[PDB]
Amino acid sequence: ISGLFNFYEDLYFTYLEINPLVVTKDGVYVLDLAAKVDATADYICKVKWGDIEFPPPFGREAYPEEAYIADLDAKSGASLKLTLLNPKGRIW
Amino acid sequence: WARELGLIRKPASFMTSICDERGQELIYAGMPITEVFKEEMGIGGVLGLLWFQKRLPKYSCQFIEMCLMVTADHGPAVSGAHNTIICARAGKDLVSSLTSGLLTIGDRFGGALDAAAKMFSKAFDSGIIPMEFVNKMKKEGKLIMGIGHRVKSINNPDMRVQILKDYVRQHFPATPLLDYALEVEKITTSKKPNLILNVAGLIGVAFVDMLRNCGSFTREEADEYIDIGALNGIFVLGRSMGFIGHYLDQKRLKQGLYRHPWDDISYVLPEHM
Amino acid sequence: WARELGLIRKPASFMTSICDERGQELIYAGMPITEVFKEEMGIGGVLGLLWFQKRLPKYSCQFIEMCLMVTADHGPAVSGAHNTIICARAGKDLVSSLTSGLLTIGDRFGGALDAAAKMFSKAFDSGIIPMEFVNKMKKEGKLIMGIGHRVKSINNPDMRVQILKDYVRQHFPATPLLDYALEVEKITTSKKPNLILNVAGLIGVAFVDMLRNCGSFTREEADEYIDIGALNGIFVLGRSMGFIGHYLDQKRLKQGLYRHPWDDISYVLPE
Amino acid sequence: WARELGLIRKPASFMTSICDERGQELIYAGMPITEVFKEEMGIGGVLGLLWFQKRLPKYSCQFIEMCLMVTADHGPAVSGAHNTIICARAGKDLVSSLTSGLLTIGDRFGGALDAAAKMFSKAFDSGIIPMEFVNKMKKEGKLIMGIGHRVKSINNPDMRVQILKDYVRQHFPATPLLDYALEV
Amino acid sequence: GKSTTLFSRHTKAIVWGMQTRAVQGMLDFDYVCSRDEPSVAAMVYPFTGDHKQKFYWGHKEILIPVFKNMADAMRKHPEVDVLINFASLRSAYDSTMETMNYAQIRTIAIIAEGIPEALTRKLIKKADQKGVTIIGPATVGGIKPGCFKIGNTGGML
Ligand SMILES: CC(C)(COP(=O)(O)OP(=O)(O)OC[C@H]1O[C@@H](n2cnc3c(N)ncnc32)[C@H](O)[C@@H]1OP(=O)(O)O)[C@@H](O)C(=O)NCCC(=O)NCCS
């Protein structure tokens, strides 16, 4: 637990849960790693994260054109967000 | 007559190594002028002969000429162009106006090439990585010379920088200092997009790379040429063309004598001295 | 804010025509720097854009570059090189030494190109024949600027003169003033053999021929550029190369502060 | 006329404090030119007004004028005089020749006044005694700037130094740094 | 471990201090002695940076290096075996000790006038320990015709 909490602290996580965890004379077995991490802290853990990936939430896959806005989100400090549910609607 | 018979000994007060004009044919650092011209070595080659006493490779001479081209002029608002224009509008000759403009060249104006080269060379010669260099510069309270632009950034690159970068990449054999500078540049652009490698910074690092990697120089000679102010000379020679152009343009336009408006000057004098 | 809204009038006190740096692109006389580089307009083309605001033909740019190279340096004995060397040995920076050297460029040193161009243009434009021009200069007590060498007379021509003259004869469309200068040269070499066309005189006359016959100029424009001192700028830009070379050289040699010997000075003070 | 109404702010790009010519009388650092001449402030007084914005005492102005007189010329062999002579013999005008001579003034020629002042001031501001200053200069391989003449020694005084030092001792209120330099 | 032969036609020396006339007289003596190469390899002068002082070998101008520090002259010239010490009475002791810290020097000439006797005794002690021959202070030096001349002995040419 002390090692896991040190890993929590120095990797700047926010949400770290194991379900289930197996403890045995052989060792420790982690089966699920429910984890949410501070994206904005990427500038500190550039080396410590390598090429970190942020999976999209459950639902429809990200649009090829919405992902372009997602890419431009990090170009400058200005915030540029877009999200789609059903392009068929009239109100935009 | 006594010197001709060699019966009197007098020391020579001057020593020169760049040009010999005593003989039949003019010589540029041990090379006759006709041999200069028959080898298609132009402004860059002549500059290499006169400044370094070396026959630089063709790509080195072309890069020197390109550097002279990009630094030729940058508008009339800068200090040197402003001084040249004011001297020209005062009715002075070409030499006086050019000189008035050139004498502003130094630390704040015209010294970014030399300062950028010195800073990047000191960083690279030390074992520090680009991130350590950026952190050290931030801690020291000094901005990195050769980084940052008015409006250009990533996804909007400086065109002079791109032209020079494309040539140096495709022609220079090895550019470790340029790669170091580009890593520093990507760090700084992650910090803020406009913090791109300047024309001054790229010219400085690529000139150091040219001196250190063209094969015509030792490490000590390249370091000495950086220390003496070869990049100051590069900027001065490049910007002389633009200053002379400004002088000629002011003479053509027949601009009258200039006097600064009083409303633009803040007069704060002692009450009664 | 008022200027942005466009409700305030203040006239501009300065006018420029050679370079625009405000926009997204650096522009030399209405030409983007990218187009300058992709069309292979080198030092000569940039010089033509910045000084004359014209796109000169390729041979004009190469001739300008050759003129810059032939006037790059002429040894350390000349006045400007002497002053640059002395300022460099005094520990001053590059700009100060170059400036000390350049400030001697004028009537007696450096201005031979411009004087030769003016003299030959004035003679040719007046319609007088070369013999009449030579006689007129002789009666006025004036040496023909651009005529005279120290060692090279005949069968040993000045090699810089030969290179420039060969290029001009092979690439220029028409060289009337150059032919006039060669006529004058034949007369003066029949006078005594070392009175050949100098590099200064040939550069002046060939620059006038380029500026009058390349097709990018009118007669008024070419005359105005000659009168303003474009050839003075050509010589200054060429010799700045040699002066900076002399500065770097004196810095390499680590030469100490110079002091003129007292035996070379004639002290004639009143008493 | 928008600026007259006070409808527009435009910051002044230049700041000056030495001379005002906008008014009906020329002003030198707050002092009118007629008052400058009435008070018999010489070249030294005008120099004090223009360089320091101060009304210097009369002995200070006269000492400044004496310093100008002493440094007026030192022959044609020095670098600056040589460059001025070369440029003059090249047919250039007064400004170009004077400028060519002046641009040699720097660390090796003409910088001895400033170097000597800085060196002696840094020694005197620290607590070191003159002997400690001499030994400290010797240790670092630095010659004491402001000491050493080619031909003049003691019992053969330099006359320019003698005149200036006599005036300074006679008229100045206190000369601590001069005392330190004389011990050195 | 003092040596019987102190000077020869191949002896090269380092002069401490700027003594241009003495070095030039040494070179003139060398040239009239049909010596192959000059006997002054380098000069040491603490008060200026490294440079090259121009002297005369016969009728041709040559460059002799001048070093701010003695260590640079010692490193760049391993062939030097003599040091003519032209330091004053206040600097002869330290310069001579620093020279004796280098084993390539077999002979030291001290020209200074008025060295304190205790400092001279310390110099003699260290020279005896190091086996270095000292041409004692308050001297013009010595002369070996055809081989080597110390400073100003024998006047000018
Ligand atoms: C000032 C300082 C250079 C004087 O030392 P110095 O080298 O003995 O003095 P000089 O350089 O004038 O002497 C060189 C010799 O050449 C002579 N000489 C000087 N100028 C000459 C010239 N233009 N032509 C021919 N001979 C000249 C001198 O008379 C002197 O001859 P000497 O053998 O009769 O003494 C030295 O003490 C020093 O460096 N001090 C530091 C402080 C300083 O620089 N002050 C500024 C001085 S205003």
Short mmCIF file of C-alpha atoms in Angstrom, two decimals, chain B residues 3 6 9-15, chain E residues 24 28 54 56-59 61 63:
data_model
loop_
_atom_site.label_atom_id
_atom_site.label_comp_id
_atom_site.label_asym_id
_atom_site.label_seq_id
_atom_site.Cartn_x
_atom_site.Cartn_y
_atom_site.Cartn_z
CA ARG B 3 66.83 48.37 -47.33
CA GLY B 6 69.66 44.95 -46.68
CA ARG B 9 67.06 46.69 -40.07
CA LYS B 10 63.68 48.21 -39.21
CA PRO B 11 60.73 46.33 -37.69
CA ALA B 12 57.39 46.39 -39.49
CA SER B 13 54.68 48.02 -37.40
CA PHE B 14 51.79 46.25 -39.17
CA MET B 15 50.96 42.62 -39.86
CA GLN E 24 67.13 40.96 -28.94
CA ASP E 28 71.88 38.87 -32.21
CA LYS E 54 58.20 40.09 -32.85
CA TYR E 56 64.80 39.77 -35.37
CA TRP E 57 66.71 36.63 -36.36
CA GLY E 58 69.51 38.08 -38.44
CA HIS E 59 67.51 40.12 -40.93
CA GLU E 61 61.38 38.91 -38.41
CA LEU E 63 57.69 35.64 -33.42
#
